[PDB]
Structure 1
Amino acid sequence: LDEYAPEGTEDWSDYDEDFEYDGLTTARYDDHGFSPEEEERQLREFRDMEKEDREFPDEIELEPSESAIERLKRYRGLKNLYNCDWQVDEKDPSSPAEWKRLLRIGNYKNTKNRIIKETKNEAQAIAGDRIRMFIRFPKFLLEKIQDPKQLLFAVYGLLLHEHKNAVVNFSLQRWEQYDKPVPSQEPIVVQYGVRRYTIQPLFSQGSNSPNNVHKYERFLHPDTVSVATCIAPVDFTQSPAIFFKPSPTDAKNIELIGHGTFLNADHSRILAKRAILTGHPFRFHKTVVTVRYMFFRPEDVEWFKSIPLFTKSGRSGFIKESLGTHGYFKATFDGKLSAQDVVAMSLYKRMWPMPSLPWNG
């Protein structure tokens, strides 16, 4: 009866990447480079920020007093999200310690099927039987037990290793006739199988990746089915999963945000915190474009030399040198860009799931 098995400590013993970002002169691109009022205000702010995210995906506004290097130091500068060699077993202070303490199952489907036929073979009692169970049980949970003839008391069995936390991925479909937003960091009560757990799930798109790297969605996509990544006890039956929030304001104490099914119990799924820097190209020549309002120090431009530029018209490019001392810099682009286009910079960060707790009442 432990969520974190002692065997999880001896499984993930080989620390591969222990990279220190403090001893870096350039960005990490060495692979390819050189009470009701508070709730109302919070709901309004979340809706406005979701609308801003829909209009502008991941843009960050930089300040003249803001230093880009110190606040953007841990980010990376990879050119392609689905081709780069991301690693899952990196050591990071932002990672939870219980990432060390997880059960790492290799293949979900084969292990799940093996456990299902094991439960076929090792069933001591056959279905449909009048059976007496003596169960170990604490004293305090006795004093909220009611009589079974007035309220249903059902007993549900658990498979092998279902009590143990692991990184799990859920299907997430937006339930109809709620236009209300939901971020990827708020707690949400999730009922799967029979068990209810409070889960703060990371939202991602279910597009397949060769390196199993997926974009972290800040909010739920209102149109397409997303994938919710979290740390939770596993289910080996692929049970449908339901998602809600308890608020006693309604007659029902349920606001039902979504529905779905248990997709996978896989630890290889990481998420990418993407940070975008957007701005207007100042001046245009035949080959060299002088770009304005990226940074405010030329040494920031030097630190951002290797990471490529991209333009929302669909055109890649690179930097050449810092023109002025206010962030003006020369750059080379694939095509000819006007003043109505937006030049932008992409930075990427590792994102880890968070642990979950059971829900009662």
Structure 2
Amino acid sequence: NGHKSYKSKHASKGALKRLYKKPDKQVSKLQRKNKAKQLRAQRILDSIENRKLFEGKNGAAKIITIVPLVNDLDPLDILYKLLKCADDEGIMDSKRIFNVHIKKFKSNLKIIIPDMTNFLNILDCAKVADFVVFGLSGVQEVDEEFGEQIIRALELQGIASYIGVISNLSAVHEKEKFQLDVKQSLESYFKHFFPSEERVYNLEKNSDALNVLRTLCQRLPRSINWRDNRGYVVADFVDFVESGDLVIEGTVRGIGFNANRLVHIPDFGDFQLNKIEKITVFESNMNRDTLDEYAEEEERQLREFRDMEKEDREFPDEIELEPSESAIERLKRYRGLKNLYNCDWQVDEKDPSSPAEWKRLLRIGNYKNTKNRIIKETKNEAQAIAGDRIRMFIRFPKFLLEKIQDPKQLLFAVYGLLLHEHKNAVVNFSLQRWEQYDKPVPSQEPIVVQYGVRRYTIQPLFSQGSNSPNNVHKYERFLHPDTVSVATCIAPVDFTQSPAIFFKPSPTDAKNIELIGHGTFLNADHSRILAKRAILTGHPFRFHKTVVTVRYMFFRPEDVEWFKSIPLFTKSGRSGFIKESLGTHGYFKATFDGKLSAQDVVAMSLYKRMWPMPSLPWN
């Protein structure tokens, strides 16, 4: 324009015309104060609503579990020293589950003791507790091969709350300052796993043991997310009726139960309940979901994986052809692509190696908007709720009766399923290695995975994590030595994103188990296409100002012609293309972005579709 324009601190009316196309309240001191008071009334009423569940003998019991980390201890010493401070000897037998009422704190406690021989039974016991009491020895320090693995495993499945306890520190008395030196060491060790806690009690002192007892009675535990969104109960008694109709009585602790649900027992699988009653009766009204799943030579094997993984780490996906081998018949299935992130590979491809189940598989899409929606309905439909004394009748196959034990001697526990979780789908897991598991893991090798209560034998497929616009990703032969990774298989879905633990059975080990890794249920996503990449390679050997010719990549003129269209690249990063076959031995000549030399190598990439394998329960 060329003119110094007009200025004003606020817009002129001329400017506004071109651009074109209840009372406020003062808070008086009284009403300020009044609002704060009536807000506090809500908070206080809300705190009562939480606590009523534990309020007394009429309320629910709190579930305590004792876990000694050293066999030196004997768990009966732990419990006995606690019971003394209750100051009622009427409290203080051929059994490992105990119900106690404490007059001193008007509190109901259930104590469960696991059988320390059965490592897997420890996890199952601790999985249901509100409080886990860790026993430590002042005399002998925990062993890395067993004692620590208890702590590490419990953390990764999740713990409602934890207490550190000592019971025998006087066994190293000279002066109690020497006891304090040891106690400081144990606290520093314990805090490494549980940095929220800074105290370990000495039960040899009356003041500490009373302090522990008070806490168990008075304080509330944390919730466990994946558990409390389901229902669960612990059996007070079990009974059998005629193929069976197994009866359990106990207390509701989760979100709740409905007689039309499905019920999982961790050792035995899914079963249907037929009736419920409250200690009114509820019956399975047949407008219900149903039980349908659809609609020394080993040294050579270990050495093989050790050698193969070392090779794959140096020269990944490189392949050797051989003379008298047809490249077509070997490789015709491979499509060949410029870039996985840009290819239009179809998900539910019709190729014959695709599993027989496809329409048979459940597919969800928006897992997030599915998960939260399902829960909202489930909590509304609950019939029995926390603290209800209940009986339940369950369709129980009579031949499994040989596996039942008296619940007074062994933990028997019951979990409700979410509706579609019985159906199989494509599922995805995060995975990273256990604390020092340096062994090679082959992508096809079978593994046992626990996630939530249930556990399955799985053969995975490994891939790296990224957000490709098409969900196509490279299949990988072995688990990366360091990064987190994504593993894919077919299994029954979980909506709660339970933590997952990865291990392999090994009865040669003291705990019968070898621990491999941990992770999380990410999602069901069938679009998570895996492509098996292959690299062929050949040697450029003669060089001209406009073309280079390459040996050994192919051995027949017919093969050079059939694969002519796939682009070439150098590992030094130049691209190129086949011109034509030269001669009968399968030489070719090619053009590239620039100068090559015999110190470079010429490669080409090809890709094949992969599909997940199915999986089966484990016990």
TM over 0.5: yes
Query: Is the Cα contact below 8 Å between 1:183 and 1:218 reproduced in 2?
Result: yes
**Alpha-carbon offset, residue 253 of structure 1:** 1.1
1:114-134 superposed Cα distances (whole Å, 9 cap, x missing partner) = 011112211111123322111
Distance in structure 1 (CA, Å) of the matches to 2:432 and 2:566: 35
Distance in structure 2 (CA, Å) of the matches to 1:172 and 1:214: 16
Structure 1 stretches lacking a partner, 5+ long:
6-36
Question: Are 1:198 and 2:457 matched, yes or no?
Answer: yes
Distance in structure 1 (CA, Å) of the matches to 2:611 and 2:456: 18
Distance in structure 2 (CA, Å) of the matches to 1:305 and 1:145: 67
Q: Identify the structure with bigger relative contact order (alpha carbons < 8 Å, sequence gap 6+).
A: 1
1:142-197 superposed Cα distances (whole Å, 9 cap, x missing partner) = 11111111111111111110001000000011112111011111110000011100
Distance in structure 2 (CA, Å) of the matches to 1:354 and 1:126: 39
Larger radius of gyration: 2
The percentage of counterpart residues that share the same residue type is: 100
Distance in structure 2 (CA, Å) of the matches to 1:327 and 1:252: 58
Distance in structure 1 (CA, Å) of the matches to 2:364 and 2:567: 37
> Aligned with 2:371: secondary structure?
helix
Distance in structure 1 (CA, Å) of the matches to 2:387 and 2:514: 36
Query: Is the Cα contact below 8 Å between 1:280 and 1:340 reproduced in 2?
Result: no
Question: Are 1:303 and 2:562 matched, yes or no?
Answer: yes
Bigger mean CA offset, 143-152 vs 231-240: 143-152
Distance in structure 2 (CA, Å) of the matches to 1:182 and 1:277: 25
Residue number among 570, 573, 576 corresponding to 1:314 in the alignment: 573
Structure 2 stretches lacking a partner, 5+ long:
1-290
Distance in structure 2 (CA, Å) of the matches to 1:240 and 1:209: 25
> Aligned with 2:394: secondary structure?
coil
**Alpha-carbon offset, residue 324 of structure 1:** 2.4
TM-score by length of 1: 0.89
Residue number among 180, 186, 193 corresponding to 2:439 in the alignment: 180
1:39-63 superposed Cα distances (whole Å, 9 cap, x missing partner) = 1110000111111111111111111
Equivalent in the alignment of 1:4: 294
**Alpha-carbon offset, residue 90 of structure 1:** 1.2
**Alpha-carbon offset, residue 341 of structure 1:** 1.6
> Aligned with 1:92: secondary structure?
coil
**Alpha-carbon offset, residue 99 of structure 1:** 2.7
Superposition RMSD in Å: 1.0
Bigger mean CA offset, 230-239 vs 325-334: 325-334
> Aligned with 1:326: secondary structure?
coil
Residue number among 220, 226, 248 corresponding to 2:485 in the alignment: 226
Distance in structure 2 (CA, Å) of the matches to 1:309 and 1:272: 19
> Aligned with 1:109: secondary structure?
helix
Bigger mean CA offset, 122-131 vs 227-236: 122-131
Q: Which has the higher helix share?
A: 2
> Aligned with 1:156: secondary structure?
strand
> Aligned with 2:310: secondary structure?
helix
> Aligned with 2:312: secondary structure?
helix
**Alpha-carbon offset, residue 323 of structure 1:** 1.7
Distance in structure 1 (CA, Å) of the matches to 2:569 and 2:395: 62
> Aligned with 1:155: secondary structure?
strand
**Alpha-carbon offset, residue 100 of structure 1:** 3.4
**Alpha-carbon offset, residue 286 of structure 1:** 2.0
**Alpha-carbon offset, residue 77 of structure 1:** 1.2
1:285-320 superposed Cα distances (whole Å, 9 cap, x missing partner) = 222111111000011000111101111112211111
Distance in structure 1 (CA, Å) of the matches to 2:409 and 2:571: 63
Equivalent in the alignment of 1:339: 598
Distance in structure 2 (CA, Å) of the matches to 1:260 and 1:183: 18
Distance in structure 2 (CA, Å) of the matches to 1:110 and 1:273: 32
> Aligned with 1:320: secondary structure?
strand
> Aligned with 1:180: secondary structure?
coil
Query: Is the Cα contact below 8 Å between 1:58 and 1:274 reproduced in 2?
Result: yes
**Alpha-carbon offset, residue 227 of structure 1:** 0.6
> Aligned with 2:409: secondary structure?
coil
1:27-50 superposed Cα distances (whole Å, 9 cap, x missing partner) = xxxxxxxxxx22111000011111
Question: Are 1:164 and 2:423 matched, yes or no?
Answer: yes
1:227-267 superposed Cα distances (whole Å, 9 cap, x missing partner) = 11100000000001111100101101111111000011111
> Aligned with 2:317: secondary structure?
coil
Bigger mean CA offset, 60-69 vs 327-336: 327-336
Distance change (3 Å), C-alpha of 1:128 and 1:311: farther
Distance in structure 2 (CA, Å) of the matches to 1:241 and 1:72: 37
1:46-87 superposed Cα distances (whole Å, 9 cap, x missing partner) = 111111111111111111110101111111011111001010
- What is the total number of aligned residue pairs between the two structures? 329
**Alpha-carbon offset, residue 332 of structure 1:** 0.9
1:86-137 superposed Cα distances (whole Å, 9 cap, x missing partner) = 1011112111202331111121110011011112211111123322111111
TM-score by length of 2: 0.52
Bigger mean CA offset, 206-215 vs 275-284: 275-284
> Aligned with 2:422: secondary structure?
coil
